[PDB]
Amino acid sequence: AQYEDGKQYTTLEKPVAGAPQVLEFFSFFCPHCYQFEEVLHISDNVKKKLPEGVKMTKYHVNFMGGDLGKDLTQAWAVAMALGVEDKVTVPLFEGVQKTQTIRSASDIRDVFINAGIKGEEYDAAWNSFVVKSLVAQQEKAAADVQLRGVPAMFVNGKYQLNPQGMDTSNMDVFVQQYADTVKYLSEK
Template sequence: MKTIWFMLMGIMSVFSALATTFTEGQQYLQIDKPAINEPQVLEFFSFYCPHCYQFEQIYHISSKVKKSLPVGIKMTKYHLDCIGPIGKSLTQAWAVAMMLGVEDKVSPLLFDGLQKTQNIKTPNDIRAVFIQSGIRAEEYDSAWNSRMVKSLVVKQEKAAVALQLRGVPSIFINGKYMIKNDGLDMSSMDAYTNQFADVIKFLLSQK
């Protein structure tokens, strides 16, 4: 009886291993020239991007994936500055949000202001969103002009170039792999989100 049990456990382990194995070119792509010193899980997005809006605000894929990451693995988000008339200002504002640790507060407001109400048209409108979310005007202005924010802007721009970013939303793992969004299971939103998380965990384990 014990022998049969161990055989069954062995079969289950094989199926488990197969279930967590993914194929290059189908669920992910390997980058020709791996980027150096990038966060382990890095997402690029734009507040102007309708797909990013759905990804973040409708289906909450980023937050669901973030919760499923292994302990100690952080998900970092960078803004792409070449989309939209105030794309560069939004990237700098995102650097302010990163510096102040208020990404989750301002992200929904910025998305809504650009995708739904379309009442964000100038850098001053962006500033008003931060104030609306509880950030003091003086704190925002100080951060906006700080050396740290300028450094974060450059870091986002350099990462986009190093990873040869072609579009958003895009998620990169260890600077070596990119998730192929259209290669995931789209039979349901849960299946898509779960496989997204599984592919990330699989790629994090690759050497």
């Protein structure tokens, strides 16, 4: 066949019921995740080929960057609740990996302030039990799928993308292969 279990994807031994249709996991400390966002625009190119009726979900993880890693997961919960993912993703990535100007929760907060979310609004969100359950969701979803590495994408709680089994000679060819695989698994 052209798409083969263990080639462009692997199958979960124990499938996750009720899981988001397309579920992506990342960390702002994760170097390929940086590429995925800034250079490859994976999430965006997947969306473009996805059917419609399809929701895409993106969650942050705790297992990189210790204390700051957990702060970043709570901040991403803030970003989702306020719907400002698309204004903070890049400066969070660059603040963590490029300029290294993010070293505390207060520095994460600065990124949001600069992106125009108001202090009062950020701190209220930060402390809200809507963000608490949003953090729980990120953790539960990761816990559900055995997650020990990022970037990671899961389709219908049954299939997991395997980017190691695609070409990397050409970034553009890599991206379409990745997205076409998501589409293929989607229809499966």
